[PDB]
Symmetry: C2
Subunit: 246 residues, 2 copies
C-alpha cells in the first residue's frame, strides 16, 4: 500500500509565512504517483496555499459539516468542498472532540456525507491515559472504529489515524513498538469486520508527535503507513520527514 | 445612525452561483459613505467573493474562534482574519448556539478577541417560543446583552442583531410593531449600561424572516436600523431589499 504523509497546519500562519513555507516544500523532488503528500491549511488560507504549492502536493480541509447545504451558519459542507475540487477532509481530530463537542455519532455522519459526495477522508481516533492505565485501549479503539467502519465502500479512499492521547501533553512518549501493537490490532478489527483484502489496502497513519529524529523508526513498523504531522509541518525541515517515507 | 444591510449566505453556494449573484449585485449603485452593505460568504468562498464584488461592498466571515493561533484544528482566529483584512465577523448566531453549543461565555470571549484585533462585530441574540410564552422576553434579552456589552466598546464597530427565535419555523409570525417593541427595549439596555450618547449611535438589526414584501415596513420602525438577511440574500432580488434602506 502507498505511504501517506500529511501536514496539519492547525490554526496557524500568515500570508508571508505560508509563502516562505511552500517555497521550501516545492524544492523537494518526489513522485506523486508513488507517495501521497497532503497539506491541510486553515480554510481561509486554502486558495492562497493551493496556488503556491506545486501540483505534486494534494490539499484538503481540517473539518467538514455533518449536514448538507442549508441553514447552518459557520459550516462548510461536503458538496461545497467537492465543487471547489477539495480532495481530502480531516474528521474526528481530538482537538475537535475535546474543545468542541464532537462525538462518534458526529464522526460517522461527517464520514457518510464526505463519501456520499466522493471526497476522501482521514478519520482520527485514540484513547486517553485513564483508559490506557486501566487496560481498555483495545475496547476503546474497537468501539471507535465500529462507529463508522461499515460505511467504508472503497478502502483506498478512507485513511485511518491513531492519536495516542495518553502520550499527547501528558509528558509521556509513545515508542514505535507501542504504536505498532495498536496499529496491528486495528488492522485485525477491519479484517474481522470487513475482510482480509479490505484490511490489506487501508492505510493507518501514526498521528502522534513526529519529528526529524523519530520519523524513520515509526515508518519502519509494518502496520504504520505514514503520519499526520502537527507542529513539525510548520517548519522547513518538514521535507526531511517526507523523505523518510520515500 | 447609518443603516446596515447584511447578507448571510449561510452554508450555500457554488463557484458558479456566486459569480452570477455578485454580477447582479454589482449593478446596484449606492453610496457606501451613507449605507453599510456587507456580505458573509462561506469561509472557502471568501477570497472568490471579495474579488468578484466591487469595493463599495464590504465582506466578512460567519464565525471566529474564541482562542488564538495554535493547536485548534478547524478553527479560524481573529489574528488570521486581521492579516487577511477581513472587516466583519458574525458572533452568536442562533444556529451556532443550537447545533454547536455556543454559550454566552463563548460570545463574550470571541467579541473580546475580535475587538482586540480590530475587527467589527455583528452580535446576535434572541428568545425562544417557550421563553416568550412565559413572559420572559425582557429578562432573557437583558442577560444576553449584559454578557458582552460590559464596557467592551466603540459604538460604531459593534452591531447588535435581534433574532426572534419564537417565530423561526414555529408557524408563528412577528409583525413590524412586535419587532419594534423589542428593539426599543434593547436600546434602553444599552442606555442603562453605557449611556444615552452610546445607545443612540449603536445599530440594532432585525434578524427574522426578511423578504421583499416586508422589508420596507420593518425598516420604517424607529429602533430598527437594518437587517441580517438569510435565504432572500441568495437571490437576485436582494438588491430590492438594499434599496429599502436608501
Amino acid at each position: 500500500r502507498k505511504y501517506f504523509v500529511a501536514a496539519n497546519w492547525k490554526c496557524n500562519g500568515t500570508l508571508e509565512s505560508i509563502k516562505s513555507l511552500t517555497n521550501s516544500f516545492n524544492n523537494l523532488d518526489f513522485d506523486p504517483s508513488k507517495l501521497d503528500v497532503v497539506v491541510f491549511p486553515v480554510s481561509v488560507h486554502y486558495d492562497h496555499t493551493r496556488k503556491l504549492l506545486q501540483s505534486k502536493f494534494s490539499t484538503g480541509i481540517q473539518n467538514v459539516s455533518k449536514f448538507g447545504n442549508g441553514s447552518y451558519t459557520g459550516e462548510v459542507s461536503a458538496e461545497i468542498a467537492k465543487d471547489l475540487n477539495i480532495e481530502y477532509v480531516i474528521i474526528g481530530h481530538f482537538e475537535r472532540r475535546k474543545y468542541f463537542h464532537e462525538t462518534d455519532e458526529d464522526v460517522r455522519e461527517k464520514l457518510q456525507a464526505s463519501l456520499k459526495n466522493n471526497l476522501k477522508a482521514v478519520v482520527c481516533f485514540g484513547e486517553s491515559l485513564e483508559q490506557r492505565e486501566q487496560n481498555k485501549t483495545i475496547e476503546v479503539i474497537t468501539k471507535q472504529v465500529k462507529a463508522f467502519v461499515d460505511l467504508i465502500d472503497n478502502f483506498d479512499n478512507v485513511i485511518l489515524v491513531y492519536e495516542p492521547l495518553w502520550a499527547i501533553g501528558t509528558g509521556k512518549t509513545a515508542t514505535p513498538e507501542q504504536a505498532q501493537l495498536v496499529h496491528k490490532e486495528i488492522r485485525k478489527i477491519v479484517k474481522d469486520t470487513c475482510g482480509e483484502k479490505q484490511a490489506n489496502q487501508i492505510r493507518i497513519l501514526y498521528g502522534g508527535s513526529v519529528n526529524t529524529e523519530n520519523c524513520s523508526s515509526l515508518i519502519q513498523q509494518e502496520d504504520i503507513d505514514g503520519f499526520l504531522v502537527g507542529n513539525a509541518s510548520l517548519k522547513e525541515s518538514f521535507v526531511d520527514i517526507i523523505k523518510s517515507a520515500m
